[PDB]
Amino acid sequence: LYRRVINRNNRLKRLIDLGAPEIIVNNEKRMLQESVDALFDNGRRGRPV
Amino acid sequence: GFSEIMRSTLEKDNTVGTDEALLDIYRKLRPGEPPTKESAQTLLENLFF
Amino acid sequence: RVLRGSRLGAVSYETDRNHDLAPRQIARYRTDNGEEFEVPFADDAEIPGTWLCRNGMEGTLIEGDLPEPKKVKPPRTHWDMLLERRSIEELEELLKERLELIRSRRRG
Amino acid sequence: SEALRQARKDAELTASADSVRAYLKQIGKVALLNAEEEVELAKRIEAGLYATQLMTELSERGEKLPAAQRRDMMWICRDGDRAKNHLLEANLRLVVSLAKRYTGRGMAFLDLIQEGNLGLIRAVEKFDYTKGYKFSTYATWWI
Amino acid sequence: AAPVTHIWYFKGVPSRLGYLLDLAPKDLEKIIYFAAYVITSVDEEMRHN
């Protein structure tokens, strides 16, 4: 779970630093949100990881 | 012919024309999808037959 | 049947002598956003100028050295990828083409 | 006629808890391209990079840059950036084209899609049109 | 890189975020999971005059 959150965080960071179209960045922030949500209480919303 | 509750529901069936429901069925077959009223016919003849 | 594991670290067991300890200095480092962090280094040790402090960001030593701020160039620009596959004359051609294009399209 | 549009809109704006489906439905909004579109977009992007390069040329004291040159150069640069984003937004679907078949081993699927998108940025960055090949033939390698 | 909502304060029932903001939870999920915008501020006096 921590690897998922760290990977998605670093990817978001590099996307922002690079400059990416709004769709991809929003997708990434959503993935980050879902990842931290799975970290805290798994499969609360969605299908458990 | 004898079907009392059948004719009752068929009076409250509030939907006429085959295509007319096929789309009912579809639409509720799965939520969130543009139906192709002609094309979803196969979906029915492809769940049960 | 038994299955044993082991963390990859030994367990040295001396006694926790609280008195006889190698003496040690303290070097206060500063991050960029005005954070003060302190680090007990051994006495005989070159107090390093920079440091990845507890705060996670870079951390500089409190004094002033600046041996080299960066001394390193960006990796490669989209400008780089473009320049290495075209000529400046061609880029200027396309630029002036766009110039004529916007001109004729907007103000006639 | 439009009665089915009621279904098409209400079902379009539904729950859809699956983030994968959310992102697919998201990328589906911008439509694909063809050869002349890709060529002109690449030309716009190159013009934009050269415009910003010449602007940083003038970043040092190169001119008291006049208002007309300022306005149309800024237009050039912003056009280049908009076209660049447009190109990625067009080919996001291709990125899912493949990520669709590296799944099921190791990683999730959105992760593959995002890594593909980052590679897609690299591909568009380094894409040439003068070789006159279709875009996907060059982008597939980087993806 | 971009802040996140702890899931215990969003998906629980009732949703404490939903109360402290007074929002429908099924309209809060669209807000935080990047499915639908929300107007966060507005310049009432400017739109007025």
Curated annotation (Swiss-Prot), chain C:
Keywords: Transcription, Transcription regulation. GO terms for molecular function: bacterial-type RNA polymerase core enzyme binding. Transmembrane segments: none annotated. InterPro entries: RbpA_sf, RNApol-bd_RbpA. It holds the Pfam family RbpA. GO terms for biological process: positive regulation of DNA-templated transcription. Forms a complex with the RNAP catalytic core and with free principal sigma factors. Belongs to the RNA polymerase-binding protein RbpA family. Binds to RNA polymerase (RNAP), stimulating transcription from principal, but not alternative sigma factor promoters. HAMAP family: RbpA. This is RNA polymerase-binding protein RbpA.
UniProtKB/Swiss-Prot annotation, chain D:
Residues 17-51 are annotated as: Sigma-70 factor domain-1. It comes from the Bacteria. Residues 87-143 are annotated as: Sigma-70 factor domain-2. It is found in: Cytoplasm. The sigma-70 factor domain-2 mediates sequence-specific interaction with the -10 element in promoter DNA, and plays an important role in melting the double-stranded DNA and the formation of the transcription bubble. The sigma-70 factor domain-2 mediates interaction with the RNA polymerase subunits RpoB and RpoC. Interacts transiently with the RNA polymerase catalytic core formed by RpoA, RpoB, RpoC and RpoZ (2 alpha, 1 beta, 1 beta' and 1 omega subunit) to form the RNA polymerase holoenzyme that can initiate transcription. Belongs to the sigma-70 factor family. RpoD/SigA subfamily. Sigma factors are initiation factors that promote the attachment of RNA polymerase to specific initiation sites and are then released. This sigma factor is the primary sigma factor during exponential growth. This is RNA polymerase sigma factor SigA. It comes from Mycobacterium tuberculosis (strain CDC 1551 / Oshkosh). The lineage of its organism: Bacteria, Bacillati, Actinomycetota, Actinomycetes, Mycobacteriales. The gene is sigA.
Swiss-Prot record, chain E:
Coiled coil: none annotated. Signal peptide: none annotated. It comes from the Bacteria. The RNAP catalytic core consists of 2 alpha, 1 beta, 1 beta' and 1 omega subunit. When a sigma factor is associated with the core the holoenzyme is formed, which can initiate transcription. Belongs to the RNA polymerase beta' chain family. DNA-dependent RNA polymerase catalyzes the transcription of DNA into RNA using the four ribonucleoside triphosphates as substrates. This is DNA-directed RNA polymerase subunit beta'. It comes from Mycobacterium tuberculosis (strain ATCC 25177 / H37Ra). The gene is rpoC. The chain holds residues 98 to 146 of 1316 of the full protein.
